[PDB]
Design a protein around this ligand. Sequence first.
Ligand SMILES: CN1CCC/C1=C1\C=Nc2ccccc21
Ligand SMILES: CN1CCC/C1=C1\C=Nc2ccccc21
Ligand SMILES: CN1CCC/C1=C1\C=Nc2ccccc21
Ligand SMILES: CN1CCC/C1=C1\C=Nc2ccccc21
Ligand SMILES: [Ca+2]
Ligand SMILES: [Ca+2]
Ligand SMILES: [Ca+2]
Ligand SMILES: [Ca+2]
Ligand SMILES: [Mg+2]
Ligand SMILES: [Mg+2]
Lengths: 200, 200
Amino acid sequence: SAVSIPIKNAGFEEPSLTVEDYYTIDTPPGWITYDPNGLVPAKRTRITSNNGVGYTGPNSAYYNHKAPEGRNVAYVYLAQEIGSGIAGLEQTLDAVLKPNTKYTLTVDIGNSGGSFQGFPLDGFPGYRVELLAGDTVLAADQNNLYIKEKDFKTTTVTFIATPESPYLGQHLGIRLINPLQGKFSGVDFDNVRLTAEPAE
Amino acid sequence: SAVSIPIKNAGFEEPSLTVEDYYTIDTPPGWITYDPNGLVPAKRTRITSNNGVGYTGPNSAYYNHKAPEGRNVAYVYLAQEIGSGIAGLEQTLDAVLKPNTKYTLTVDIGNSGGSFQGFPLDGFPGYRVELLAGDTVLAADQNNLYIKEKDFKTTTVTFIATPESPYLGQHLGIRLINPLQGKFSGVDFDNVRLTAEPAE
Ligand SMILES: CN1CCC/C1=C1\C=Nc2ccccc21
Ligand SMILES: CN1CCC/C1=C1\C=Nc2ccccc21
Ligand SMILES: CN1CCC/C1=C1\C=Nc2ccccc21
Ligand SMILES: CN1CCC/C1=C1\C=Nc2ccccc21
Ligand SMILES: [Ca+2]
Ligand SMILES: [Ca+2]
Ligand SMILES: [Ca+2]
Ligand SMILES: [Ca+2]
Ligand SMILES: [Mg+2]
Ligand SMILES: [Mg+2]
């Protein structure tokens, strides 16, 4: 029997947004911008690399169906050329890595489609989802799921920490990454969940 | 109906070894060493970081079962401390990245156990498996599978290339990586396969 690990703003439902297709351009509350190649400015515009939340409802321009969870999805957009690097959202959790524990990290990934002000949203930069302890990537999935235009799909990253793990006691983390491997170079995320259960 | 893509020395059966638990310390034929943090020297000894093939039959001291395929597995051993970097095995293939095609990379991963002349082999450095186009990681699995001591498990890495992919016409590649996330810091591979099939 699997226990949920608390995540802040796990569904990006904060801040609440009023109108369909509206969005913020500030880091979703409870999350941090992961920007190892310095592609995302502190003060963003609508044409810079940016991240935030977007109201995706039953009549979204960008997806067939509403947000997998609630009304909002998170998004990560990189303006720069392909190969310029990677960026995304990260959150350090209160839970620490425990031995003999199977961790299950699920998140829905969106390939926004259609168009914004005449600009085609066709194409996708890919995704990479990472479970961390300290500053170590313990386990990751990059692009194992194909995601159609205007669609979302759930991925699962799993990891088992042994008593021998050098990372026990270190704070867990979750990273949601735009690897900038295609244009249009926007990727969306929703419904982040992490569970712990006993393993052998 | 998936077509298999030709890989040199896919099963690490070259070179042909004849005695149980014997092993080479040179890069398997067909493959190059992947050594981006300079942990693996050009002239190796039995005590340096190294890679090679290893006869793994029904009597092996390191695995319960024989090699997943044939009588050899590949190994990648890193002598340096955890965190010192990553290394592994790489092979650029003939075949290139085609649009509307689903690639399935499967490879068996081995957690050597037991002991060698008293020295214990418990612990595991993790693994990462990469499908490449050119120098780009299209898709990857890092440590989604838990591998018990003395066991092998099969991982599957899948990727779909869309007609608007930037890497079409670049050579497919395979990387099998020891990310030095634990000790004993050896990891084994066997039975690499890559298939292609039409994809929506
Ligand atoms: C292309 N751009 C740059 C910033 C403005 C914009 C979008 C606005 N909403 C959007 C929803 C989906 C995709 C793009 C946008
Ligand atoms: C604001 N931006 C900039 C580019 C990407 C984007 C959105 C992505 N998904 C969304 C869903 C609803 C509203 C906006 C976006
Ligand atoms: C324990 N060490 C490091 C130095 C040499 C070595 C091994 C030799 N054969 C081996 C087979 C399996 C695992 C390790 C070794
Ligand atoms: C020779 N080495 C160096 C350290 C690791 C190792 C082996 C790993 N698996 C193996 C299977 C058969 C024989 C040797 C090894
Ligand atoms: Ca949501
Ligand atoms: Ca798209
Ligand atoms: Ca073999
Ligand atoms: Ca081991
Ligand atoms: Mg920045
Ligand atoms: Mg070297």
